[PDB]
Structure formats: structure tokens, C-alpha cells
Amino acid sequence: DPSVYDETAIEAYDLVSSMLSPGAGLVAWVSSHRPLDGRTVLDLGCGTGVSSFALAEAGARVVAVDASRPSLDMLEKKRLDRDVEAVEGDFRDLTFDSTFDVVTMSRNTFFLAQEQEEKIALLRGIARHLKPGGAAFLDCTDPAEFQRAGGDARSVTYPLGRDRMVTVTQTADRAGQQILSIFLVQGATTLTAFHEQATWATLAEIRLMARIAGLEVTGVDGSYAGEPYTARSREMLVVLERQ
Amino acid sequence: TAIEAYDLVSSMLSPGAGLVAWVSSHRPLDGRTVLDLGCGTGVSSFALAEAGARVVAVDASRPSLDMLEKKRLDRDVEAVEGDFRDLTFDSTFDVVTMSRNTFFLAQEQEEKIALLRGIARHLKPGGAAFLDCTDPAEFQRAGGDARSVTYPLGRDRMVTVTQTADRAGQQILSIFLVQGATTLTAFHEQATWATLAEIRLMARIAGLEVTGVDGSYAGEPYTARSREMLVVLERQ
Amino acid sequence: DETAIEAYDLVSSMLSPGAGLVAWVSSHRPLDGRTVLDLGCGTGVSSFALAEAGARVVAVDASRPSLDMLEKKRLDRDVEAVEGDFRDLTFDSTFDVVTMSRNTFFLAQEQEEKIALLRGIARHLKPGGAAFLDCTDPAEFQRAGGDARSVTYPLGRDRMVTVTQTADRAGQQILSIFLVQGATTLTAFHEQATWATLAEIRLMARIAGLEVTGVDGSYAGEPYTARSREMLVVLERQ
Amino acid sequence: TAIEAYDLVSSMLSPGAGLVAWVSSHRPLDGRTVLDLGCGTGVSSFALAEAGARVVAVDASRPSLDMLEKKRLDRDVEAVEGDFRDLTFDSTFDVVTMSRNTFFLAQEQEEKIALLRGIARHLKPGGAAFLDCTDPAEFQRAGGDARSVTYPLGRDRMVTVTQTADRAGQQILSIFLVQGATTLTAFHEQATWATLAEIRLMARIAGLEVTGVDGSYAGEPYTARSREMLVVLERQ
Amino acid sequence: DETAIEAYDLVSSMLSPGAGLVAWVSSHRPLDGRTVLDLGCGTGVSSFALAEAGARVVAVDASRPSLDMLEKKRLDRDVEAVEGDFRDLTFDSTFDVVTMSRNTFFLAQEQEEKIALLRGIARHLKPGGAAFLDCTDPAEFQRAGGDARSVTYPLGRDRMVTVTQTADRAGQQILSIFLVQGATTLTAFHEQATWATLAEIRLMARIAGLEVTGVDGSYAGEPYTARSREMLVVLERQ
Amino acid sequence: ETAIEAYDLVSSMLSPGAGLVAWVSSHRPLDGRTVLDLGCGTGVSSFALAEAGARVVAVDASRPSLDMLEKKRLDRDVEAVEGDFRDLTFDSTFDVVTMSRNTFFLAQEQEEKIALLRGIARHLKPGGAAFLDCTDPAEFQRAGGDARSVTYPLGRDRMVTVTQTADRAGQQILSIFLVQGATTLTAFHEQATWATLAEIRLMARIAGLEVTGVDGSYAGEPYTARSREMLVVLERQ
Ligand SMILES: Nc1ncnc2c1ncn2[C@@H]1O[C@H](CSCC[C@H](N)C(=O)O)[C@@H](O)[C@H]1O
Ligand SMILES: Nc1ncnc2c1ncn2[C@@H]1O[C@H](CSCC[C@H](N)C(=O)O)[C@@H](O)[C@H]1O
């Protein structure tokens, strides 16, 4: 069956994201700005729900959007009794109209709207789907981190339990602001490779994009702990609200 | 005295020839009109006029224009006092220039947008604007920690440049300490940089479009290895 | 040499003002009306800042010319200038607060000298008092493999100082050359120090009867971490 | 089997198209004779043959030539066992190629001189030799400390490359660890680099002259910012 | 664990063979017919190199599975395997030489534990004996700011190990993850250590009755300098 | 000329001859031996060699530098000779030939270094040795060749700022020297073309010499990847 290849990749992705990007940091960071217990969350690029389920475990009701039907398939299988509604859609152009208390984009998902005009269209969609007093959250690596080796290939290998491992190889083009991550997930007798390419935006770009789209950046933290964003920050956690 | 030192540093460290050679590879200058924004004491303006151009040189510093005039001799340069964040005249030009990093002296993003609006309003239909910039990645190589380099300025003068930066505010501060055998003059300039991606958006808001970027005065395309960011803009 | 002391006082006044030390110290212990022992006081930049927060300051330096400059500058500030070696303090007296301004602690060069200093600090602390070692994080000194680096700072409109630094990681030695210039003047001096990491200081403190009870990463008082560039050590009697 | 693993690594990480494009920009290949030295399993040789060249391909590894001949099909490539430090046949060619860093596998300087002498002896009057090399400054960036990068090789295979260097001996060692879900094949190559300055000297000794140097397959001039050192040599 | 110990023995045998340790020790104390206490002996990579130089070896480790492997490999070599905690040795023998192989000293984590370890070394040295701490220079652990880095090494033709390290400069903590692989096998283990600089070690040694008497920068015996990447510490009594 | 006086002060303080003398003495005796010191300048190297007992012939193309040498010479056995070390015309042989720190790089083109080395071979007695005192050129590349400045004291009343740029493809290194007192400023510059040890081996062979030793510091450590100096000992083939 052909789609087993993509299913195995989605399973690997879910394992990598579960261990290397748990939802807890996003949940801790969002909660420092807005209450989640009893509120509504629009989670854009929910994937297999690592971010979505952690938001639900904080008491939120989550509407979780992804363009990948197999990833939503895995979310529904793992959902169990969690209050997460899986929705197939393109976060560059949301068709349905509703408004939420908080909107979230997990670590670097915002950079998967590649072109600047795609980021703008995405932000217009976030504005249109935000309650007047709502706030949207862009969980991002500070893009300075992507330029540290001149964009040359670098590889780091992490354990995924004592039976699995993942090697991440990353290259970047500073002029196009492109970053490409190859993921090689291995067990004793298995190897699954998949990749993902993103176009980053700096905080200064996001201020202009937000302004174009009808949003305003109202806060930036430098870590999940809520420290303010400074030159020494390695993360760029953007809070936005309607103009 | 500080304006004199400023003029010497600019004449030696940022001569106008590269800007002229880079602008010339995109637009002819002999006989064309040029609006030179942030002309200062005129180092860029003079080099443009000497390429054939009728130049209108604009600066907000009356004392810098004073020295432009005393050094202009017979070059075709009309010095004008004005704020390039809000130009108040009605001319239209073949070519608009901003010398090395002058663009970064419109500090806030809204000020760069107001400046680029003014530039669009003063371009002829087929004109082109030129932003001579350091690639801002260069400002970030030391984490923004104070670094100093010392340059000769002839056989009798020298300048020490000490720079600090804040990457989050995109601020860069340059302190200039100009010395002779028995003189010391100090001055500083602080700028807010913007990346090419930022400039693409600012251009669009303002009514212009980036139509080319070069990586050096020689005309290499702008790549991740470029250390300069030479932006060409046209009306959309 | 007199011109050297003037140049030193100007550099310290501009690039190491006492305001930061006073703010940090005030985060942990009150100064208004308390007694402060300021060790390695120099020409008084730290000491005057401490006196201006209301402390009764006893200021100790081994450099009689520096103390002379301190006394010239002192005016009515409540600072007593004492010539002495802080590796071996001669007088008996206990204080609410003991201070060592930025990197002065590293001027007791050998580890045994640092230990002798810390014992003196312990013997001059009131039971509830605290000692404060204001230090650069010594990781900062190893940044270029100890190779010579120079940075030039303005000192107002008409003066400047170029600081050239070299370090030897194995001896934990750092050498700073200060070249102070005006239009028609040039004065050079130097200072060589031996740094100690926080881990070393914990040991030396314990040997001397002190305990490291707090470490801040900057004058603003956030905790010391791997990302800190300053190492501001609070110590108390055991 | 290490031969199979090497062929896979080279086919995907250093295909011949780059070398072919670079050589083409200096000499035509359609219908010409080409001597490909250290041809290996023929990644370079077959790209050259597909450009229309008649290729004699020399390697000292008979298992590698076995793989070449297995892969050849109808491509115009003659496989020859030989040591390019001492080529013992007499034919004369239009173009001589050595693929990425193969020139560095003649280890000692005298071996490199012997190799270049053989290249001169096998070049036709208006012919040209091509040394495709990394710029050796790239090998010193980490002080020669061990560094590892892991590359995909399609969906179900990968190679980890671990490199160490010795600046004083100009030695670079590469370990290749090729893996699939249930396989692991390891092999290594050790090389001795030479800078452009050394190559100019070795060339004159051997009877050649460096006539061009490019910094990339796209034919940019070689400069301080180049990361490749592509050398064109002609007979004296 | 059984496969974990085997993976460890392969990694140790190939990435840190005993030959270097023995050549270094032998340049300070000839070993033929001497008694050697090898602390943190593991599966005996250091212990058997020492025995092969002619020493009579007591090899101490807290891991019974590792000592079982040592005993399986021992054959005729003069090594006695003893289960014990080197922070607190309960037997009373004395030795010409005490060895701790590469970075094993850093596995006595806290400063107080290193001191107890060093006291135990002193109590177990004969008159004129010497102890040898084979360490990486901890400056190496601070490149990259403690950020995760990975390096992959072959282990023969058909096995490999990827070592991934992270560090916290303030805690002086270094964590190494070892991922050992064959064509169809994957075994992961890890070790976390607390480093100490030479300056720290001098102090701990003195607190424990010992004295740093020599420091080499490599197994070849050249002196320890700012350029050294290894810190090979020689200790003797009083 | 003030430039030469500043040159002498900078060279005397930032590059004393003592290290060269100690390194050379660890390979050949100097006491009563003959030394050809090429590119002697104002004699910082030549005088330190004479203090070790050498009978020194000191060659330089700058007549004003030689004038200052003769003026500082006083007692010492140093004969100043105006000449071009790429084309030495006198005919004498010596026990030792020296080139002080980085002077070998002032023979700019590779063919000029080869002519120099041929002259060295022609002026060495059999059994003699030649010494090229050099910075390891890797040091010139540490900043990608970007401008870097370091300021050194020159006593209490003088200083010098050295600003260096490099072009790794041309193997060019440019040093600008800004010498100051309280009331003076004198600027001058020197540009050189470096050669690596591997280049020097080949150039030596072409010229009839052989590299027989390389040290990594004046102490005589061996030359390794961690060395920051490249001290080359050469002998006739
Ligand atoms: N235009 C688009 N519209 C919707 N989803 C998109 C998209 N572009 C990318 N995605 C999705 O964005 C996801 C990014 S990975 C993050 C997944 C999840 N939030 C977690 O916490 O792990 C992928 O699932 C991808 O399919
Ligand atoms: N609105 C404005 N805001 C900031 N700087 C302005 C300005 N209008 C003019 N300037 C001038 O911008 C100049 C930057 S320096 C560049 C000067 C000149 N083009 C040269 O080639 O040297 C200063 O002279 C500053 O006074």
C-alpha cells in the first residue's frame, strides 16, 4: 500500500515532535499571557496534535487545523477523550469563519507560510479569527540561530528513548532566509528520512507584516519562562492582538 | 570642528566612487538628474556631479550644507535644507541616491516608510532609487560587543571607530575619535538597520518595488556571502 | 605617576562608576546608616558612591598616592582613608558590609593570598553582615584565546582610553594596558590580575570561614547562569 | 561492497554535472578525447561521456573499474588500471580531468609533481587539464578537530562523514559511514592538500602553467571568499 | 545492561585505549613490579594496560556488571577486581601508584565528593607514591557554549558510536550521550560528570593532604599551557 | 626621516632580536662565526646577533635605514652593506644567514623568493645554515583578512597601533603602523606576500637548499598544527 510510506513518515514526525518539542513549553508560555481553562484555542498547523493535546490538557477547547490529512488521521487516533476538533485546511486561506480567545502556532510553524505575502495572508486570517480581546501566539526560534554557521550543514543527534534516535541536519540560505531540516529517525533495524523547509522572518519583519494584516505585536518573550526578548535571546515568542 | 572631522572620515572611508560605479551600471548619469538624500558635506554629491549629473543634494544639517558649499567649487550641485522623512518640493528625478548606510538614519520603520514614500513621489516614471547599505549581518558578528578599528587618514591624521550594536533593537552605534599630532575630535552616529526582507515590505507599503540587489559595488548578485546590500528600487 | 593616578581616576570614573555596585549591594543589605569596609578603594569611586547611599565608609588601599587623590576628591563625604594591605588587615573593627569593586578581588594574585584576604574579610564582618565581590565572569577573559585585543572608549568630548588586554588561561592571568589620551597628552598604566571562577571562590570561602550565599549575573540582580557575563558574589560568615 | 557504498555517496553528493559544466565553460567536450584520472566507479567519467566526449578513465582500484564497466552500458568510456603518479601509456588528449579533490590523493609533493608531469605528457598542444578541488582553507575551519555531518542518500540510506585534519602536514582524513535500515558499511580516504600557490610551483616544475582559476562551477573568479579552487592548467 | 556494558567496553577500548595513560604514568613512576590502585576501573581497559606494563593492579569499580566483564577479559593478567565506591574506600592497602582514567575523576560529582575521593587517595598512597588524574581540559567542554554537539566515530569496520554532548558552564556539568550502532543493533547509554579546573584541583588536593606536583598537556608529557587540550594531573603527598 | 625612527622604535620593542638569537643559537654557534643578516633594517637583528659574538654583514636596500644602523652601531662588529637581497652581487660565504621576523615575505613574488633563496645558497659555507624567522601565515587568516587593530605601549611616552588586512587568495598581508606620543603622530605601512612551509619546501628545492628543520617557537618546540610561528632552518643540498 503506497500511503504506508507517508504514514511511516508521519509516525516518525510525531515521535520527533513529541520528544524534542513537547507542548508543555508553549502551554506554559501562552498561559503567562492569557488563561486557557475554559477558553477556545485555534491551533494552526496542528499536525499530529502534540501542541493541540497539551492545550486541551490545560482546559482549552481546541480547533486544530492542518493541511495534512494523514497527520489529522493520526491526531484523531491519538485523541481519545481530549477536546480537540480536527479540521483540514490551509492556514494561508481559512474558509470557515469563527473567532477564538487564543490562536497558537507551535515552534516555527509560522515559518511554513513561505513567501512574505503568504505570511501576510496567514496573519490576515489570524486577525479575522481572533476575538476583539484575543491574542495570537507565534512560537519561533530566534532566526539568528539559523545563521550561526553561515548556513553550512550541521548535524546533531538526539536519543528518542533508548531504542530510537534522530539525526537533524540543517542548512540555510541567509539571503533567501531559507532553512532546511533533514530528519533521519533510526532504530536498531529501521530508518525513516523526511525533511521540512521554512522561510524565516525576523521580529522587525513580523511587526510590518502584522501591521499590514491588521494586527499589532503587543509582546515578545525570549524563552518559555517569559523573560523579555533581548539581543541574548535564542527564542522569539511573539504575542499579537487585533489593531 | 566635528563637521570637519566628519568630512575627512567620510572622504577617506566612504568615497563616492563606488556608489557612482554601482548606480552607473543600472542607470546612466551623464546629463541625468539626481536627488541625493542625506548629502552631508557632499562626498557622494560631488562624485555624482563629476559623473555628469545635475544633483540636488538634501540634508537636515545646516552646518554640513555650509561645508558642502565651501567645497563645491564649480560642481553642478544644488544644496537644499530639508528632512528626507518629509520632502516639501515638487521635482521629479531620473535617479535618487542615499550613500552608505544613510538609509539607516531614518530610525523607526515608519520613518523609513515615509522616506520611501517621498522617494517614490520624486522618481520619474522610468527612474530608479539606490540604497547603498552595509549588509546588517556585518553589524552582528561580535554579539554587538564593543569593537574598535583604527584607520590612517593621510600621513598626519587617523580615526578610531568603536562600534556597539543591539540586535534586538537593530541599533548600531559608531563612535569616531579623529586624531592628529596635537588634536582630538570625537563624534558619534547611531542608526537603526533594516534587512533586505524588511526593505521589500517597506518598499511595497510606500509604493516602490525592489527590482535588483547587488552584493558589491562591482555588481555581483546579492547572496548569503555578500557583505554589502545595494538595493535598487523602482515605482510599482 | 601623579598624572598616572589622575588618568586612572578618570578611567574608573567613566567605565566603572560606583552606581552599579551600590545598586547591587542595596539589593541584599541596607547601606543608609550602616558601616562599609571598602577594600582596594583606589581613588574612591566605589567609596564615594557608598558614602552617597548613606554609609559610613572605611576605605583601604595599599597605594598612598591613590589615597591622596581620594582625600583631595572627598569633600565632606564620610570616608576614612586607610593605607593598608587587604591581604593582612592591621586594625580590629567589624562592619555591616565589605565591598570589593569590579575585579579588585582578582588583585590578590595567588590563591593563598585570596584565602588570606577572605579570612580578613570574615574577621571584619559583623555576625549578620555580608561581603560583596564585584567581578567580571572570567569566561569573558578567555574569549580570543588570550590573544591581545584592544578596545577604545571615549572619556568625554576631549579624552579617550584604549584598553589592550591579554590573558593566559593556564595561569588564569589577565593583563590590561590602559593608554589614556587627550589632544596633547598621553599616559599609560597597566594592571595584572589572577582570576578565580565561582567554583574556586566557593572553596576558598569555605577554607576562610565564609559561605557563598548568593551570586548574581548582573547589577540588576538576576541569577548567575551559564549566560551571565558578570559574577557578583555575596558571602557571609559560616 | 565498499565500492557500492562509495558509488552511492559520490553519485548523490558529488555528481559529475558540476565538473562537466565547469570544464565545458573552458573547452568543448562534444567529440573530444578526455583523460579522467582517478575515475573511480565513473561518476565523473559518465557525465563527461554524456557530454559527447570519448573518455579514457584511469583508476588504481580494480574493484572500482569493475563497477564502472558494470555501469557503462553504451557510454563511450574505456576503463584502464593504472597509477596516475606514473602513467605508462602514450596517448595524448584534448582534456584531462580530476574530479573533486582527487588531485590531493597523490599525497607527497613529489607525487603531485610526478602526476602533473604525466598530465603534461598526455596533453595535446591546445589542450587543458582541470583540477576540481575544495579550497583547502575549508579544511582548517575547525582547527582540524573532528566534525561530522550526516547526509540523506535517498529515502532509506544515509552517510555520516567524519573529518579530521592536520594543518602542519596538510592532511585531511574523511571517514564515511553508510547506513540503511539493516546495513552499515564504513570506509575512509586520506588526502594531502595543496594551496593554489603550491600548485603554481608544482606546475612549473612539471612543465605546465596555471592559466585559470575559478571559485565555483558557475565560473566566478577565484578570490579570498571562494570555497572551491578549480584549476585550469596548460602546457608551457 | 549486558549489551550496554559490552557497548561501553567497545567504546572505551577504541576511543580511550590504555596505552596513553600508561606511557604518561610511566614517565613519572616506572610501573614494572609496582602496585597500582586503578579507581573507576570499569571493564579494565586502563587496568589491563597497566598490568601489561608489569604492574600489580587492584581495580575498583561500583558497577558489578563492569567488573564481571573485566574478570572475563582478564586471562593471566595481574588484576584484582574489587567492588567499591571510590568516594569511600573501605580497605586499607597502600600502593605505589593510584590511577583514574580519562575524566573518571569528574564522576565524583560535587566538590565535597572530589575532596573525599582525594582524601581516600592520600590514605592509600605508600610513602613516595603518586596519583594520576587523566582529564580533558574543561575548556574543551565550553566551546559552543554548552550547546548540543555530535561527533560520530567508527568502531572497527562494522560498528560506530555517535557521541552527543551538552554542558552547563555555571554548574560545570557535562552530559555525554553515547549511541552505539551496528548494521542491526542500537544501544544507547549516557554519563554526566562535573568538571573541575586545575585551580580547583590544587585547592581540593591541599584540603585532602595532597599537592599537585606536575601537570602535563598530553600523553607525550609536554607541559600544561593555555594551548593544552588535556589536563593530566600528578599528585603527591603533603 | 621620522618614519625610520618610528620603524626602529616599533621594531626594537615589538620584535627584539633576542628571540631570533636564541633560536638560531640552538641550531648553530654564533660566537666568532660569520653571519649574513638579510634585510637588516636599522639593525635590531644585526646588533642582537653581534652581542652573541657574531661577525655580522648586514644587508639592506634602504640607505636611510643603514645610516641609522651605523649611527647606533658604536662598538659592534656589524658591516652595513647597501644591496638587494634578491640579487646579491658580492661573493662571500658565511656560517649563518638570517632573516628577521617576516622579512622573507618582503621578497614578494614566488620567483623573487626563489632568487633570494638561490643567493642564500650561494653565500652559505658547506655546513652552514640559513634561518627564516616567520609568523605562521595561518595567523594572517584568522579574521578572514578583515581589518583588525591592536595598540601596544612603547614605553611610557609612546605607543603604536597596528592595523592589518589580508587577502588570502593573493597571500597579501598589509600592516599599517600608527606611532604616537603626546604631541606627535607618524604613520607608515608595510605589505608582504606570505608563503606556507609547503611552498618554502618547494622553493628551497628549486634554489638548491633543503628545509632541514622547522620550529614552532623560539623555545624550539616542534612545528605542529598548534604553532603560531614558523621558524625555518635551511641547509645546502
Ligand atoms: N499552509 C498550511 N496550512 C495548514 N497546515 C500547514 C500549512 N503548511 C504547513 N502546515 C502544517 O504545519 C505543520 C507543522 S509541524 C507542527 C505540528 C504540531 N503543531 C506540533 O506541535 O508538532 C505540519 O503538520 C504541516 O502539515
Ligand atoms: N532627515 C534626516 N535624518 C537624518 N539624517 C539626515 C536627514 N537629512 C539629512 N541627513 C544627513 O544624513 C547624513 C548621513 S552621512 C552621509 C553624507 C554624504 N552622503 C556622504 O557621502 O558622506 C548626515 O549628514 C545627516 O545630517
Ligand SMILES: Nc1ncnc2c1ncn2[C@@H]1O[C@H](CSCC[C@H](N)C(=O)O)[C@@H](O)[C@H]1O
Ligand atoms: N594588596 C592590596 N591591598 C590593598 N589595596 C590593594 C592591594 N592590591 C591592590 N590594591 C588596590 O586595589 C585597587 C584596584 S582598582 C579599584 C579602585 C576603586 N575601588 C574603584 O572603584 O575605582 C588599586 O587602587 C590598588 O592599589
Ligand SMILES: Nc1ncnc2c1ncn2[C@@H]1O[C@H](CSCC[C@H](N)C(=O)O)[C@@H](O)[C@H]1O
Ligand atoms: N594513484 C592513485 N592514487 C590514489 N588514488 C588513485 C590513484 N589512481 C586512481 N585513484 C583513485 O582516485 C579515486 C578518488 S575518488 C573517485 C572520483 C571519481 N572520479 C568520482 O567522480 O567519483 C579513487 O577511486 C582512487 O582509487
Ligand SMILES: Nc1ncnc2c1ncn2[C@@H]1O[C@H](CSCC[C@H](N)C(=O)O)[C@@H](O)[C@H]1O
Ligand atoms: N563513585 C564511584 N566509585 C567507583 N567507581 C565509580 C564511581 N562513579 C563511577 N564509577 C565508575 O567509573 C567508571 C568510569 S569509565 C572508566 C573505565 C575504565 N577506567 C576505562 O579505562 O575504561 C565506570 O566504570 C563507573 O562505574
Ligand SMILES: Nc1ncnc2c1ncn2[C@@H]1O[C@H](CSCC[C@H](N)C(=O)O)[C@@H](O)[C@H]1O
Ligand atoms: N629586496 C630587498 N633587499 C634588501 N632589503 C630589503 C629588501 N626588501 C625589503 N628590504 C628591507 O627589509 C627590511 C625589513 S624589516 C626588518 C629589519 C631588521 N632585520 C629588524 O630586525 O628589525 C626593511 O629594512 C627593508 O628595507
